[PDB]
Amino acid sequence: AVDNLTINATSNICQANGSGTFNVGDKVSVYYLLDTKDAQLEEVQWALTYDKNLLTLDSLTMPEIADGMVNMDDVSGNASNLALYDFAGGKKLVEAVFTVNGTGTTNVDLNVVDLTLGKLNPATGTVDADSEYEAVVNGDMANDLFDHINSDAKVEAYV
């Protein structure tokens, strides 16, 4: 089809949406940036939703999290590590690559269910209990979440 697909990327932890418009057959990266400021990520649990009528999921990863679990059936993932994952400056938390099959307008959403941040205890090289920050708990976001993170949702041609 010569008509296009507009993809809007949202997340509970993103104040703004991302958007792009693409040709049928194009490959598209939808990714979510997380910046943990002067802290690090300890734990995350998330689920991603998309419309299989319009997109085909080609890959789903946590590019910064080598020991993360991605469930391709449920389109979800999780990670937890006492050594932490350094998201200072902003890094990709989740990246989904799709092929555009259909046309119109569609939403891709990252639902962050759990998110805990922390800092290392220089004496141990593992997370300091007193540093831990409960950013999201069972889908409930902290009142001061955006004092502790920056985030962004991006939709771009795949390279």
Ligand SMILES: [Ca+2]
């Ligand atoms: Ca077109």
Ligand code: NA
């Ligand atoms: Na910074």
